[PDB]
């Protein structure tokens, strides 16, 4: 099946990504708090709902929160400033708080139930967000010789996510706070730049263009 692309709201960031966030892939964004990774997650949750000539996939979003990062008022603000109805937009974002890493895994199995239910409807799930994908794993699998088991548990969690991306043609978008192995399809580093901008760089991505994107955090979420 064809790869779908979700616009980030920034033409600059979309160009760096080769056209937007891809379905059938895990895109991992990482950086410090306020680097834009969570603002990007909130923006994609709105953008995915738009038709394709507006950069979306006529879809709905699922948001797994591990650190209380989800702000329904921010989705509302982004929707209203893009000409959309905030109540309808929020209704197309299914949210869950993950209490620990094991609950996070169970939430991914429940996500599959909703994705299956909506697959052949007019508004299928097209984006699954996991914000701070590693926070619970790093908090729980810690101490002497914990690296091996944390990496095995994370490898399995990422394999379940890759399966949902590829099997149901959805984009999986995950975030992380800053020599370890990583299994995301695409890794993007975000940082705060000069003049209130955010700068994005692709990590280990020769398959895509050399360069960096510059974008802003605005009342529309993410834009140039």
């Amino acid at each position: 099946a064809t790869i779908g692309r979700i616009s980030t709201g920034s033409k600059s960031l979309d160009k760096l990504l080769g056209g937007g966030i891809e379905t059938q892939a895990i895109t991992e964004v990482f950086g410090e708090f306020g680097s834009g990774k969570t603002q990007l997650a909130h923006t994609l949750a709105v953008m995915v709902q738009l038709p394709p000539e507006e950069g979306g996939l006529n879809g709905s979003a699922m948001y797994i929160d591990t650190e209380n990062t989800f702000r329904p008022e921010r989705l509302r603000e982004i929707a209203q400033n893009r000409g959309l109805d905030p109540d309808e937009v929020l209704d197309n974002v299914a949210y869950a708080r993950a209490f620990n890493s094991n609950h996070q895994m169970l939430l991914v199995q429940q996500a599959e139930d909703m994705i299956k239910e909506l697959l052949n409807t007019d508004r299928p799930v097209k984006l699954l967000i996991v914000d701070s994908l590693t926070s619970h794993f790093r908090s729980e699998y810690i101490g002497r010789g914990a690296l091996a088991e944390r990496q095995q548990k994370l490898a399995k969690h990422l394999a379940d996510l890759h399966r949902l991306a590829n099997l149901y043609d959805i984009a999986v978008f995950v975030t992380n706070q800053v020599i370890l192995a990583h299994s995301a399809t695409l890794r993007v580093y975000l940082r705060k730049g000069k003049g209130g901008k955010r700068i994005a760089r692709l990590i280990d991505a020769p398959h895509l263009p050399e360069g960096e994107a510059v974008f802003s955090i605005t009342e529309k979420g993410i834009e140039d």
Binding site: M62, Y63, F70, P72, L75, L90, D91, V93, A94, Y95, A96, L107, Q110, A111, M114
Partner: peptide, 4 residues
């Protein structure tokens, strides 16, 4: 999950 629950609707936002």
């Amino acid at each position: 999950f629950h609707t936002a």
